[PDB]
Amino acid sequence: MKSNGCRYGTHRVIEPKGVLPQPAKILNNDMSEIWDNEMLIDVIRLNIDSASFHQIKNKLIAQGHQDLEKAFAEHAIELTNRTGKHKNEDTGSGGMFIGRVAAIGDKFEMKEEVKVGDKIASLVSLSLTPLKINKVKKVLLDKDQMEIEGQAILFSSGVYAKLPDDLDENLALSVLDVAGAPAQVERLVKPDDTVVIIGANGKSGILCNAVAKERAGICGKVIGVVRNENYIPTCKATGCDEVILAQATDAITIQKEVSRLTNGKMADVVINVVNTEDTELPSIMAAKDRGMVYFFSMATSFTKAALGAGGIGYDVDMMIGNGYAHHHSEIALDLLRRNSVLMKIFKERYAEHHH
Amino acid sequence: MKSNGCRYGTHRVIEPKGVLPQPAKILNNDMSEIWDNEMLIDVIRLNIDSASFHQIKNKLIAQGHQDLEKAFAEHAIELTNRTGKHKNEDTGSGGMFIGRVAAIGDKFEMKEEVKVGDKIASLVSLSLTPLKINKVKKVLLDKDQMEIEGQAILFSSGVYAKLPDDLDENLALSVLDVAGAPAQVERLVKPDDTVVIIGANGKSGILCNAVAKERAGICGKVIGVVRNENYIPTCKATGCDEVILAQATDAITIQKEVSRLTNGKMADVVINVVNTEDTELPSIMAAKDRGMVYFFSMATSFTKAALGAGGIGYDVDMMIGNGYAHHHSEIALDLLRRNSVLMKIFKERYA
Numbered sequence: 001m002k003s004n005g006c007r008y009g010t011h012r013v014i015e016p017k018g019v020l021p022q023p024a025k026i027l028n029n030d031m032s033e034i035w036d037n038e039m040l041i042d043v044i045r046l047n048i049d050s051a052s053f054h055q056i057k058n059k060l061i062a063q064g065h066q067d068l069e070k071a072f073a074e075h076a077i078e079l080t081n082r083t084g085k086h087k088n089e090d091t092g093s094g095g096m097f098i099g100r101v102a103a104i105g106d107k108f109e110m111k112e113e114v115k116v117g118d119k120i121a122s123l124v125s126l127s128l129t130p131l132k133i134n135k136v137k138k139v140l141l142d143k144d145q146m147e148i149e150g151q152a153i154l155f156s157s158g159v160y161a162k163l164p165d166d167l168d169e170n171l172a173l174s175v176l177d178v179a180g181a182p183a184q185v186e187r188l189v190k191p192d193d194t195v196v197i198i199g200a201n202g203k204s205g206i207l208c209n210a211v212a213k214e215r216a217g218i219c220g221k222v223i224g225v226v227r228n229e230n231y232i233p234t235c236k237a238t239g240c241d242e243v244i245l246a247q248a249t250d251a252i253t254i255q256k257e258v259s260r261l262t263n264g265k266m267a268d269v270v271i272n273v274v275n276t277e278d279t280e281l282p283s284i285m286a287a288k289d290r291g292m293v294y295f296f297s298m299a300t301s302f303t304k305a306a307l308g309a310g311g312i313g314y315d316v317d318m319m320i321g322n323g324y325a326h327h328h329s330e331i332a333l334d335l336l337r338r339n340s341v342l343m344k345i346f347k348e349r350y351a352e353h354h355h
Numbered sequence: 356m357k358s359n360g361c362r363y364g365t366h367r368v369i370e371p372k373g374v375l376p377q378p379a380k381i382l383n384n385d386m387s388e389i390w391d392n393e394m395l396i397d398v399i400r401l402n403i404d405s406a407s408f409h410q411i412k413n414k415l416i417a418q419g420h421q422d423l424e425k426a427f428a429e430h431a432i433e434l435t436n437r438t439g440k441h442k443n444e445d446t447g448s449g450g451m452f453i454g455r456v457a458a459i460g461d462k463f464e465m466k467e468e469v470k471v472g473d474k475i476a477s478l479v480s481l482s483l484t485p486l487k488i489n490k491v492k493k494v495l496l497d498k499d500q501m502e503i504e505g506q507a508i509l510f511s512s513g514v515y516a517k518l519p520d521d522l523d524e525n526l527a528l529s530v531l532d533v534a535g536a537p538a539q540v541e542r543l544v545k546p547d548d549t550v551v552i553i554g555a556n557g558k559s560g561i562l563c564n565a566v567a568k569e570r571a572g573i574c575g576k577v578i579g580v581v582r583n584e585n586y587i588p589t590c591k592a593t594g595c596d597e598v599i600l601a602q603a604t605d606a607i608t609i610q611k612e613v614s615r616l617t618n619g620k621m622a623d624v625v626i627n628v629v630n631t632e633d634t635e636l637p638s639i640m641a642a643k644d645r646g647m648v649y650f651f652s653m654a655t656s657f658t659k660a661a662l663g664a665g666g667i668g669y670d671v672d673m674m675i676g677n678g679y680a681h682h683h684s685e686i687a688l689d690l691l692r693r694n695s696v697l698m699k700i701f702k703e704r705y706a
């Protein structure tokens with residue numbers, strides 16, 4: 001194993017030469033030998049980023065491909081062979097994965113105690129991970145996941161977690177992919193706050209609904225936004241006091257409905273968890289003056305948010321959703337254990353149980 | 356005056372019929388009749404964004420033509436008369452306009468007090484501004500300016516300011532262009548904070564250096580980051596206690612040098628104002644734990660920031676720098692009037 005390993009894994013970077021793995025366009029996908037403080041994982045399953053999966057899927061369809069599950073599998077193997085990593089070349093987003101530890105480097109900065117063989121989750125993005133895909137066993141088009149056989153590198157700077165034993169690996173894969181959303185909502189929402197959750201039926205949305213109502217309290221107000229009337233009971237069961245039916249791209253409808261529901265006061269906090277483009281301005285226009293707009297979505301464009309707010313004279317704080325926060329995996333899992341409505345939904349949507 | 360006017364400009368949106376003036380491709384430029392909540396202005400000069408004027412030029416050179424200034428005019432007439440606005444259809448950008456108020460709507464949400472015939476600067480992009488161009492008088496290459504004889508609409512949600520009576524027109528516009536940056540930094544910097552300003556030598560950077568030192572005060576520490584050793588005196592003159600020499604795209608150098616100047620404590624606040632790509636992680640890696648990173652540059656990539664920080668286990672807050680903040684014009688003009696060193700550099704650079 002090579003000796004002088006950058007904990008950020010600059011030694012894997014190929015192009016351009018002076019940037020770190022995530023902004024890098026091409027990384028080193030050679031698992032023949034690892035560096036001194038890397039880590040090798042035999043990859044079970046990829047959870048591609050929802051904003052990315054949705055963009056690739058719509059790309060393959062516009063390209064006219066016949067068997068999406070095959071077209072997607074080819075899309076993965078091709079891009080990972082050419083770039084070294086599954087980073088979407090149009091959105092910049094990645095995803096995460098679960099696997100079994102193959103090789104711990106001599107100087108790997110062991111955080112959580114894991115030995116060779118343990119089954120862990122890479123909570124850092126696929127947008128920075130050197131990944132080799134040998135075969136794609138299965139594409140799950142409606143769950144953003146891919147069973148594969150392959151290997152990936154964890155740098156000593158990366159975030160990882162030994163899988164909980166109380167849940168199945170696929171439910172754990174799903175909750176951990178968005179564990180940063182409820183952790184951040186816990187910090188943003190104060191008692192008596194009005195919170196608007198745009199994309200409230202989604203995977204991170206239903207966790208944010210619940211945490212938002214816990215934090216805002218009996219006299220706070222949680223408002224979900226969805227475009228399918230069938231989602232309304234789930235949004236209310238997971239925390240929403242009110243639900244607006246609107247396209248997340250519809251700024252004028254969302255602003256009028258939030259205004260009506262709040263006597264013109266609008267929202268202290270807006271949480272954006274959709275996976276499509278052009279929802280920046282609708283998110284901004286739901287916020288009270290000097291309110292907080294937290295963009296968790298990887299379909300967010302920095303330019304549409306910045307110029308969207310400025311163009312209409314909105315002075316609101318606009319945050320870039322950080323998928324990492326300290327203890328987020330513990331905080332997310334604790335939310336599931338405390339909330340059985342949420343645990344039931346997650347198992348039904350993302351786990352593979354029997355009866 | 357047409358009633359039921361939308362403060363956001365939707366009533367002047369033609370294509371697509373579901374989004375706001377900014378992302379829309381087609382706008383209505385009929386200045387024959389304005390809405391009750393609008394302001395008609397007589398545009399004197401069009402100040403196209405550098406990257407847009409450095410695209411209409413580098414496209415017309417290919418098809419030949421003549422003069423280049425004579426071809427930019429033709430392009431703008433066609434774009435504004437068809438699209439309804441001067442938003443580039445490739446870079447998606449547009450600068451600002453100066454001119455004189457011609458009509459004030461009855462129910463218009465007046466911000467700064469102006470009258471008919473006052474000379475205003477628009478603080479929203481041309482990318483959302485209904486614009487009609489009757490004739491171009493001159494096209495100022497390399498300065499990105501366009502004298503015209505046209506009119507433009509500001510919506511009740513627009514932002515504008517009257518030109519100062521006590522500062523050069525070009526000096527004031529140059530500072531109005533970046534006024535959102537020092538206004539927002541004075542909210543983020545607390546007393547005794549370590550602040551790192553990446554791009555400390557630029558136009559918005561020296562404004563941020565000064566605000567950062569004022570707010571952080573005698574026992575705080577302001578650290579500039581520049582690529583060129585000739586920039587150190589300017590940074591110090593405008594507030595940096597220290598300057599780091601490094602390429603903005605070099606996270607590992609910047610991180611080691613900030614650890615050096617701070618005994619490994621790093622920055623409570625990192626301010627990024629370089630207009631160059633791949634500077635997200637270099638900005639993040641200068642922050643201490645649970646520190647704040649402010650991205651003001653349009654070169655920022657949302658996913659590079661979000662997935663940069665999460666990818667390395669950095670629990671820092673990251674903010675999209677708004678080009679607008681309440682009273683930002685007055686806040687930046689007052690910063691210039693209070694700070695003579697800053698004022699002199701500005702007049703020397705942009706007047």
Ligand SMILES: NC(=O)c1ccc[n+]([C@@H]2O[C@H](COP(=O)([O-])OP(=O)(O)OC[C@H]3O[C@@H](n4cnc5c(N)ncnc54)[C@H](OP(=O)(O)O)[C@@H]3O)[C@@H](O)[C@H]2O)c1
Pocket residue numbers: 049050051052093177178180198199200201202203204205225226227228246247248249272273274275276296297298299321322323324661662665
């Ligand atoms: N910051 C990070 O590190 C990080 C990590 C993971 C995820 N993310 C981002 O967070 C977002 C949510 O992730 P997720 O796993 O929760 O995704 P998800 O399960 O697919 O949820 C997306 C939700 O958005 C809704 N939606 C999308 N477009 C809409 C529109 N135009 N109008 C109304 N609703 C719309 C969808 O409802 P429909 O059924 O109506 O489409 C769905 O409920 C994604 O953008 C993802 O990229 C970021």
Ligand SMILES: [Cl-]
Pocket residue numbers: 404448449450480482
């Ligand atoms: Cl612009």
Ligand SMILES: [Cl-]
Pocket residue numbers: none
């Ligand atoms: Cl404090």
